[PDB]
Amino acid sequence: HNLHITEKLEVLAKAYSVQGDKWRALGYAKAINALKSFHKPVTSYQEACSIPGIGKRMAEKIIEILESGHLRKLDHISESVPVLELFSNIWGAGTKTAQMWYQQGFRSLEDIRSQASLTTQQAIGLKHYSDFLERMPREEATEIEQTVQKAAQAFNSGLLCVACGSYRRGKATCGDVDVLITHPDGRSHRGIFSRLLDSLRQEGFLTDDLVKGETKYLGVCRLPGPGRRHRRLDIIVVPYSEFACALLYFTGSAHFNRSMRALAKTKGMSLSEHALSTAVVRNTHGCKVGPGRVLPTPTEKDVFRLLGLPYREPAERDW
DNA sequence: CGGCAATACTG
DNA sequence: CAGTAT
DNA sequence: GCCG
Numbered sequence A: 001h002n003l004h005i006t007e008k009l010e011v012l013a014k015a016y017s018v019q020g021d022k023w024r025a026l027g028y029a030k031a032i033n034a035l036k037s038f039h040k041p042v043t044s045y046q047e048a049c050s051i052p053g054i055g056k057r058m059a060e061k062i063i064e065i066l067e068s069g070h071l072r073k074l075d076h077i078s079e080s081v082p083v084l085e086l087f088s089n090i091w092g093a094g095t096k097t098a099q100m101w102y103q104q105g106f107r108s109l110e111d112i113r114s115q116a117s118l119t120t121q122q123a124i125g126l127k128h129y130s131d132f133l134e135r136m137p138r139e140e141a142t143e144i145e146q147t148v149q150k151a152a153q154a155f156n157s158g159l160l161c162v163a164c165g166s167y168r169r170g171k172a173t174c175g176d177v178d179v180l181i182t183h184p185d186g187r188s189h190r191g192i193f194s195r196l197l198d199s200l201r202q203e204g205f206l207t208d209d210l211v212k213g214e215t216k217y218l219g220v221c222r223l224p225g226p227g228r229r230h231r232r233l234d235i236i237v238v239p240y241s242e243f244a245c246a247l248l249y250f251t252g253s254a255h256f257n258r259s260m261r262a263l264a265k266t267k268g269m270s271l272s273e274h275a276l277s278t279a280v281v282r283n284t285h286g287c288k289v290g291p292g293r294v295l296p297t298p299t300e301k302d303v304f305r306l307l308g309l310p311y312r313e314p315a316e317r318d319w
Numbered sequence B: 001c002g003g004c005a006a007t008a009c010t011g
Numbered sequence C: 001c002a003g004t005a006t
Numbered sequence D: 001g002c003c004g
């Protein structure tokens, strides 16, 4: 991890992000990652360009941090950024909402609470603003999973529950708990969703709903007892036939998925949480114009294999 | 020049 | 649809 | 921002 010009770049990328410059922020994220994967501290401008993800623009800046020890660009970052970052850390609020609030004169969570127009979701976010920024100890993620699993298996022992996301990637802490559910039957997943949620509300485990779709649930839970914070909980239910892909998707990491999906595209294939497809027809702009065929994928290894990739353990997918 | 993953919910 | 979220 |  020899890299600490990135600290200065992190700031820039994060500023570009809150400000809405999606793609410029992506560029940075790539480079800011590359530099962290580079064994040897970067010495020369040419050594910079040599790394995938770093071009001339980025190189020049990496050079200014070596010679000057500072970064001129950081000096001229708008004063709105900290405020925008503050607002866009409200669940249900992104760059568009954050910028509007700022343009309307709001500067603090206090301003937001008393004067801002909040959606149902955002009101819930503000209400847990501090909790939603905290990562839980891995061991708490476990209890949460077991709580859901136990409640799901209650009215159907056949059901299958798996904690994915950072948890399955074996991370020490977890932003939220990502619980994937399916059934070997491939038909019992039918609407059991509702019964499970209602049940978890009863015991007071689920405190708030943010999203309730046919197959996706985003909510807020809390385990009983003292010293418990509110934790974000995500649950998806999927047909058994889509299990492998769902698992692969819901495990991540995000950058891993985007990478794997970009690779699939180059091969005229397509990857979603539903399936790996082939014979996928696309126009000039990368958009889909032809569906193609679904490829059989009983396990995650099938996906890797079908893409001509060596299998990778969840822990290895962590970017 | 122009894509940078692909999907689900909300209102 | 635009915005936000995984 | 980077890259084909």
Ligand SMILES: Cc1cn([C@H]2CC[C@@H](COP(=O)(O)OP(=O)(O)OP(=O)(O)O)O2)c(=O)[nH]c1=O
Pocket (backbone or CB within 6 Å): A164, A165, A166, A167, A173, A174, A175, A176, A178, A249, A250, A251, A252, A253, A254, A257, A258, C006
């Ligand atoms: C955000 C995002 C996520 N995914 C997938 C892959 C990961 C899981 C879990 O999402 P999460 O934010 O909890 O990330 P997680 O790995 O669980 O790390 P945390 O402990 O939650 O911060 O969803 C994706 O395909 N595209 C995206 O933009």
Ligand SMILES: [Mg+2]
Pocket (backbone or CB within 6 Å): A165, A166, A167, A174, A175, A176, A177, A178
């Ligand atoms: Mg998580």
Ligand code: NA
Pocket (backbone or CB within 6 Å): A088, A089, A090, A091, A092, A093, A094
């Ligand atoms: Na947010």
